[PDB]
Design a protein around this ligand. Structure first.
Ligand SMILES: COCC(=O)N[C@@](C)(C(=O)Nc1cncc2ccccc12)c1ccc(Cl)c(Cl)c1
Lengths: 305, 301
């Protein structure tokens, strides 16, 4: 029993965290094989952040301008290239702690673990979801840039995020490991605002299935709904539309609990219109949307890494 | 900015997780140096669970009855001893991945990370707190026994918990790494019930200070209170009494935010009386009590 917000074990990623220093800026880098990946804004100071020509700033840099530190060992930079918003520092040493890894771009609603680092040193791990507005509600302080988001698939680490910045509302923006931003964000100093967020519907439904698996049934009802009627109601409460893909994905949880997805939709529909009424689901007074259907299965079955 | 429930990086503890098998039972062990620590109930049979004599069952066991597996390598048991509710299996290999560590016994209200394992294999990490009733609200399935609770402070792993059992309410009971149970629990199938839980008041106040640091001030008020008047109100909502130690502990957060501890106590009384009114504090509609004053300072500086 129990349902906690659980991150993947961070050991395989901790062995990849390095400190990258370029001039006055110190952020984190991800050392995989003989390459160190980090946000390209490390080559930026104060005027280099306002209106920056990154190709122009990078051509002016030499390999010895980047001080890379793996623990107490300085890594020798032998090359530098830029792919989108990520800087790639070729080093002389291949990381012996390099795990089996992939660079994957995730979709909104998908969750991943974040290993928050400061000065190439891991300080915490947490689980969060790529919001529909492409931001992450992270916990980051100055110096966290270059902290990575990942999923662990069997023995393979799928890197899906690199932290670049904090928006004025306290939410975070970053890129996949190929330097492509998540959302309409750019890596510079300009007016950028996160779009109005929406709730990840498939994730709330998965979390309601997890509540049923844990003995919380108070919200269940005898009613069912059509997918169209549910989406008409969901749109009104700023909830993401539920597709037939989502209904299919929730199939195993529906089979395990004996509650059809559209029957669970009718419970969510009542919860949106009438509220919790002083009651809680899995210790929460709000509908949780940062557990995917796979996360629920993984935690309520016992999958290991 | 931001406030998340944050666990410590689990790498240093992952390198210590082994699988311990004794007869039909398979749970997790913690391999530190040449010793593997695990719950002593790994030696228990079917009829030897309601009233087990552990000294008697252990004297009947030999080193080859324990199959210890570190990844795909079978470790060789060369000794066995029992310290309270933990079994210590002396092995012939010192764990090369052994970090700088300590065994620390924590007090209720203290937080720690849990690395949940199944068959000596880490499946996930989460944060939780020692409840005032000495249980943890964990997420554990059968086979998670021997999973450990830890804190990491300046390169050193402080082991503070080892999972032993699930109570009938779904909450969990376990021991410190010296085998001493937290709470009035025993490692027997006897009728055991967790005492009625209470909210960790000092932790809620620390979390309200974290909300102020993050710009959330809606709950603040013009009032202050006496510690006695606060405790009289707190006990009515099943909140732990706030001691002068707690008031002292919240001093740095009080200095940083400019809100006196007893002034924040008056905010908390009002929150208890009125509720949230559709508003949230740090993305929560409930008062969070699983962040210590030390966690708040750590995360906000
Ligand atoms: C055959 O195992 C039955 C069982 O419950 N065994 C465990 C081992 C048990 O509770 N363990 C489990 C741990 N954490 C979550 C658990 C969720 C579900 C089930 C089991 C959990 C048990 C039981 C009674 C005692 Cl006194 C002790 Cl010390 C241990």
């Amino acid at each position: 029993s129990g349902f906690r917000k659980m991150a993947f074990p961070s050991g395989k990623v901790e062995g990849c965290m390095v400190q990258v220093t370029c001039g006055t800026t110190t952020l984190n880098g991800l050392w995989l094989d003989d390459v160190v990946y980090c946000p390209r804004h490390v080559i930026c100071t104060s005027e280099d952040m306002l209106n920056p020509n990154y190709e122009d700033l990078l051509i002016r840099k030499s390999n010895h301008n980047f001080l890379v530190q793996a623990g107490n060992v300085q890594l020798r930079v032998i090359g530098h290239s830029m792919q989108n918003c990520v800087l790639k520092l070729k080093v002389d040493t291949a990381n012996p702690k390099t795990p089996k890894y992939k660079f994957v771009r995730i979709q909104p609603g998908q969750t991943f673990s974040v290993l928050a680092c400061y000065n190439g040193s891991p300080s915490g791990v947490y689980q969060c979801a790529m919001r529909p507005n492409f931001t992450i509600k992270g916990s980051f302080l100055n110096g966290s840039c270059g902290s990575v988001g990942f999923n662990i698939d069997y023995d393979c680490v799928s890197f899906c995020y690199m932290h670049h910045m904090e928006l004025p509302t306290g939410v975070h923006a970053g890129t996949d490991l190929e330097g492509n931003f998540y959302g309409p964000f750019v890596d510079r100093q300009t007016a950028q605002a996160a779009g109005t967020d929406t709730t990840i519907t498939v994730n709330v439904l998965a979390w309601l299935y997890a509540a049923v698996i844990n003995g919380d049934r108070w919200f269940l009802n005898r009613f069912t709904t059509t997918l169209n009627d549910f989406n008409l109601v969901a749109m009104k409460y700023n909830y993401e539309p539920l597709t037939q893909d989502h209904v299919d994905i929730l199939g195993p949880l529906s089979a395990q609990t004996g509650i059809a997805v559209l029957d669970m939709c009718a419970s969510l529909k009542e919860l949106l219109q009438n509220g919790m009424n002083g009651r809680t689901i899995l210790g929460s007074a709000l509908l949780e949307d940062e557990f995917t259907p796979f996360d629920v299965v993984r935690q309520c079955s016992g999958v290991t890494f």
